[PDB]
């Protein structure tokens, strides 16, 4: 998931 990963969670997940 792109939510549980900091680099992508900066976007908005």
mmCIF file with all atom_site columns, C-alpha atoms in Angstrom:
data_model
loop_
_atom_site.group_PDB
_atom_site.id
_atom_site.type_symbol
_atom_site.label_atom_id
_atom_site.label_alt_id
_atom_site.label_comp_id
_atom_site.label_asym_id
_atom_site.label_entity_id
_atom_site.label_seq_id
_atom_site.pdbx_PDB_ins_code
_atom_site.Cartn_x
_atom_site.Cartn_y
_atom_site.Cartn_z
_atom_site.occupancy
_atom_site.B_iso_or_equiv
_atom_site.pdbx_formal_charge
_atom_site.auth_seq_id
_atom_site.auth_comp_id
_atom_site.auth_asym_id
_atom_site.auth_atom_id
_atom_site.pdbx_PDB_model_num
ATOM 1  C CA . UNK A 1 1  ? 0.000  0.000  0.000  1.00 0.00 ? 1  UNK A CA 1
ATOM 2  C CA . UNK A 1 2  ? 1.112  3.551  -0.754 1.00 0.00 ? 2  UNK A CA 1
ATOM 3  C CA . UNK A 1 3  ? -0.228 4.711  2.622  1.00 0.00 ? 3  UNK A CA 1
ATOM 4  C CA . UNK A 1 4  ? 2.026  2.590  4.840  1.00 0.00 ? 4  UNK A CA 1
ATOM 5  C CA . UNK A 1 5  ? 5.099  3.899  3.023  1.00 0.00 ? 5  UNK A CA 1
ATOM 6  C CA . UNK A 1 6  ? 6.416  7.343  4.134  1.00 0.00 ? 6  UNK A CA 1
ATOM 7  C CA . UNK A 1 7  ? 7.786  8.488  0.676  1.00 0.00 ? 7  UNK A CA 1
ATOM 8  C CA . UNK A 1 8  ? 4.333  8.075  -0.872 1.00 0.00 ? 8  UNK A CA 1
ATOM 9  C CA . UNK A 1 9  ? 2.320  9.047  2.172  1.00 0.00 ? 9  UNK A CA 1
ATOM 10 C CA . UNK A 1 10 ? 3.784  12.548 1.820  1.00 0.00 ? 10 UNK A CA 1
ATOM 11 C CA . UNK A 1 11 ? 1.739  12.987 -1.345 1.00 0.00 ? 11 UNK A CA 1
ATOM 12 C CA . UNK A 1 12 ? -1.554 11.815 0.090  1.00 0.00 ? 12 UNK A CA 1
ATOM 13 C CA . UNK A 1 13 ? -0.880 8.115  0.177  1.00 0.00 ? 13 UNK A CA 1
#
